[PDB]
Design a binder for these strands. Structure first.
Lengths: 188, 136, 52, 217
RNA sequence: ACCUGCCGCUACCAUCCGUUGGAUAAUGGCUGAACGCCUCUAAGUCAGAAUCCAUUCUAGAAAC
RNA sequence: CGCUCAUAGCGACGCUGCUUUUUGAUCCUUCGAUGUCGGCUCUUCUUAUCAUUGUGAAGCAGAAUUCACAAAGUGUUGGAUUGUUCACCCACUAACAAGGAACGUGAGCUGGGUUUAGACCGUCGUGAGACAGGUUAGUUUUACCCUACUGUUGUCAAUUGUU
RNA sequence: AUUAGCAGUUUCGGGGGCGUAAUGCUCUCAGCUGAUUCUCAAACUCUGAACAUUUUUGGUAAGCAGAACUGGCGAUGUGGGUUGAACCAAAUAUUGGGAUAAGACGUCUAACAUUCACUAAUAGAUACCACAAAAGGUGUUAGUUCAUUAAGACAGCAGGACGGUGGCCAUGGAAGUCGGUAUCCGCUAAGGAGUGUGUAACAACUCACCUGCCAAAUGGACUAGCCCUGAAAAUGGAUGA
């Protein structure tokens, strides 16, 4: 009926900092100052020491408690990002009409020229805080690195979606951009 | 059917008459008349004849001609509309009397086209252009 | 490469489970339609596989 | 049914009309066969019982009954061997449904053979039940039970209303549980008659087991 | 009566003209719990219809 | 059934439904009379979406289909035959999908039918006469009222300065 | 009316190996008779019940038609059910104060506080009464059963997942796995002549099966409360707003 919730928590090492002034948090580290907001299902959170961070909740549902974990997870992810960047190494595939993707960083946009004979550009603006390099082996692989897991990943997904055909079979063309390795973290 | 226009459709529709109008065959094949059933591409609306082409393909019949060619529908090609039109040009082509030819369903005219043929029609249907020495 | 990439491609599209109501491609080890209109059916074909 | 969709013969009403010396156009029931499996199989050899029972008083059609039986017919190789199978239904469609027909089917207005003398020819033969009366029964060995309940499950769809499946504590088609139905064999006061049982007669019989001994064989 | 016939009115029987933003649906995702995994979802959110609502357009309130 | 394979696509036997676009059952309202049927005309409406757009399936290689959803924004034809819807062919087409709205619409129509008087034929009837039997000819009246609507004057007398 | 086997039989019906067909043995059929069971009968009973509601007949059903008892609109409205011939409250002389009735008590609209759970749904909200079903749901709430677990679990990930042996078949081949059958043992904590993927077929991987770590709960199966799916029709739209 009411089954009583409790606090999960997250550990913050001594190359990174955290503020939280009004149930909204900005973790900071060597990469940058990555931010995400909370308080929205009456979700109470408080910092105890420069080492722990805790999200307290002791009166609610299963539903309420579900939120608590998620928030914690998100903050952990953010922390990780701030320590060292989330990497999304995609790989594309075609050589009948070789898939040709180009980019600008700073403006942070990716554009797809040739794609299943598409003579258009498919420009897609990446969110802020996403870089893109590419040690290509045989006209394959783009990488997108970024700090906020949540945003970089989203951007990647968008890109993937853009490299897709909406008509005819999917076992016909097995081509487009495809994320080979997500949840990857560079060695610092 | 067929269909191949053009580039463009050589602009607007004009007719001599819609459905139920005789025009001569203008053809070495022994069709002597061509009477319209309807016109191709006419999608049409409530109460409105399927109206004659400027140089476009029609569902037609040999009403008075060879008995072999008589009965049985036939895709044709309008060649000259008695009733007039302006072109993207500022001229008003107008003719003696309506005329066309019986044709193949890839547009192709059978023998040789008799008399004068509006240039639009020729442009539309390359076979027509080929098979005549009058394209005015 | 092409085998290592085709598999990947399949994973993102062809090897997920459809519904027998909404036909909605869930995910490779799915168990309910996850829709309101369906009523999370719990009836799930795996989406077909072909060599052509 | 054929002339009707069973929505007008869903619920019990009117007193019972039957295949009688008053009716006669009464059709033959859709099943006159009610058992499925080894009928030679003993009372003792099978000790497992599941029932099917309605929760609401409703008139099950003979066709419906037939359909139900021929789920459990086909759920038998799936079960595993017809040898380890009994069935009996235990609801025979005795009662008959009336149909005054509407003579107009493509056109033509009566008001002459309309609703005057409009008494049903009997078409439809059907069985009544209540809020727990049995509508299928299965004796079997203790091997098949998740099989038989699945057959019943199929049967459940082939019947109107909310049914129910209960496993009896008896040996199947017997008024003794198991606690009792070992003591009969164990003490050895049982008497057998094929698919049924009898039991020796002390509080069963007395005036004819007064000066008698053939009544302890 | 007939042939011309102006201004005028008019014939896809002539001519010229009929746009672009956010909001969503289905649906495809993203992070992501409930349910150590896993999941388009519960918290949160990305794309996205002839749709929605605006922009443009007609009238202009006992409205200013 | 579907090579294989219950549910891609179907789906026997059986059960539950919706619907008021069939017709019957009915006779509650109208016989001191709601003008009966059809077709032309025209709006608006419902979705059970035929096309369209955006999508998801497939036994989807492609084209071509088939199935599902969102979705009624926009489109949904010309004839021959029949009093005619219904019907039944030809013809184009993106598609020629279903319907409703006093079986939408007779002071909007013609009246083709049906429903009177005249007649003809058949059948039935001793006959007068009958016939969801055919056939042929057979006055569609009234708005100058109230409203609703189209467009137009006038008012905006507390839309505050004689405007 | 009507299902089921069981028993004693049947040179008194019939056919098989034996025997004269056999009814004798060993099998099935037919008929009789004896002991049991299934379901049961408005026009049956050994036995027996103190327009509204309840009973009931016909009807697919209807705001259809038709009966019984009683209650209701007739010289009978009022208060209530949003509104209303039949439901309730309850009977109508003309008045005042009081206190109740049915029914309400956010606002409409006289009439509030408290306290606990449930729902998160374009939901749901005053019997009659203006609709909803079967069947679905890893929505949430409650609950019942049995099982797993300190011999250390679940979920997860990490490791191992062998031999006789290519068992016999079919079969160049199909070796656990086109397909079929029998489906046995050795060694081990541990491993089915094997759940799938896959391979021409073997393999490889994955499962069953066993251990590492984390460290305490876990798994199924139903049951019923609310919510959802089902759940489409015609002017705009009604828990009365």
């Amino acid at each position: 009926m009411k089954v009583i919730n409790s606090s999960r928590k997250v550990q913050i090492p001594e190359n990174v900092t955290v503020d939280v002034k009004g149930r909204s948090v900005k973790v900071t580290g060597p990469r940058g100052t990555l931010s995400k907001s909370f308080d929205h299902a009456s979700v109470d959170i408080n910092l105890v020491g420069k080492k722990e961070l805790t999200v307290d909740l002791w009166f609610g549902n299963r539903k309420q408690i579900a939120c608590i974990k998620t928030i914690t997870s998100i903050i952990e992810n953010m922390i990780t990002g701030v320590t060292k960047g989330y990497e999304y190494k995609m790989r594309f595939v075609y050589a009948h009409f070789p898939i040709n993707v180009a980019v600008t960083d700073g403006g942070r946009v990716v554009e797809i020229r040739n794609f299943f004979g598409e003579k258009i550009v498919r420009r897609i603006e990446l969110l802020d805080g996403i870089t893109c390099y590419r040690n290509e082996k045989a006209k394959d692989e783009i990488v997108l690195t970024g700090n906020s897991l949540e945003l970089l990943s989203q951007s990647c997904a968008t890109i993937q979606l853009r490299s897709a055909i909406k008509y005819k079979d999917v076992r016909k063309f097995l081509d487009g951009i495809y994320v080979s390795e997500r949840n990857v973290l560079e060695s610092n | 059917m067929s269909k191949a226009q053009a580039v463009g459709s050589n602009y607007r529709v004009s007719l001599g008459l819609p459905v139920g109008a005789v025009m001569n065959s203008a053809d070495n094949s022994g069709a002597k008349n061509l009477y319209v059933i309807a016109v191709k591409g006419i999608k049409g609306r409530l109460n409105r004849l399927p109206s004659a082409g400027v140089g476009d393909m029609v569902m037609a019949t040999v009403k008075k001609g060879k008995p072999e060619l008589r009965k049985k529908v036939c895709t044709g090609l309008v060649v000259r509309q008695r009733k007039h039109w302006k072109r993207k040009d500022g001229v008003y082509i107008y003719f003696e009397d309506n005329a066309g030819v019986m044709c193949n369903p890839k547009g192709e005219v059978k023998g040789n086209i008799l008399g004068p043929v509006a240039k639009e029609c020729s442009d539309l249907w390359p076979k027509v252009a080929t098979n005549a020495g009058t394209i005015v | 490469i092409e085998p290592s990439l085709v598999i990947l491609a399949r994973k993102y599209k062809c090897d997920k489970m459809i519904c027998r109501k909404c036909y909605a491609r869930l995910h490779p080890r799915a168990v309910n339609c996850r829709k309101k209109k369906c009523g999370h059916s719990n009836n799930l074909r795996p989406k077909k596989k072909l060599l052509k | 049914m054929g002339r009707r969709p069973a929505r007008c013969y869903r619920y019990c009403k009117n007193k019972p009309y039957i295949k009688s010396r008053y009716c006669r156009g009464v059709p033959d029931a859709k099943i006159r066969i009610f058992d499925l499996g080894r009928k030679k199989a003993s009372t003792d050899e099978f000790p497992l019982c599941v029932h099917l029972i309605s929760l609401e008083k409703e008139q099950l059609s003979s066709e419906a009954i037939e359909a139900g039986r021929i789920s459990c017919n086909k759920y038998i190789s799936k079960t595993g061997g017809k040898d380890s199978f009994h069935m009996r239904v235990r609801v025979h469609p005795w009662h008959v449904l009336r149909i005054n027909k509407m003579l107009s089917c493509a056109g033509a207005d009566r008001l002459q053979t309309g609703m005057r003398g409009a008494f049903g020819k009997p078409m439809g033969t059907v069985a009544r039940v209540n809020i727990g009366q049995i509508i299928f029964s299965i004796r079997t060995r203790d091997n098949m039970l998740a099989n038989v309940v699945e057959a019943l499950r199929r049967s459940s769809y082939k019947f109107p209303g909310r049914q129910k499946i209960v496993v009896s504590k008896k040996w199947g088609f017997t008024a003794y549980n198991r606690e009792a139905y070992q003591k009969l064999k164990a003490d050895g006061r049982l008497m057998n008659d094929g698919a049924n049982v009898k039991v020796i007669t002390n509080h069963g019989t007395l005036a004819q087991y007064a000066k008698d001994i053939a009544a302890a064989n």
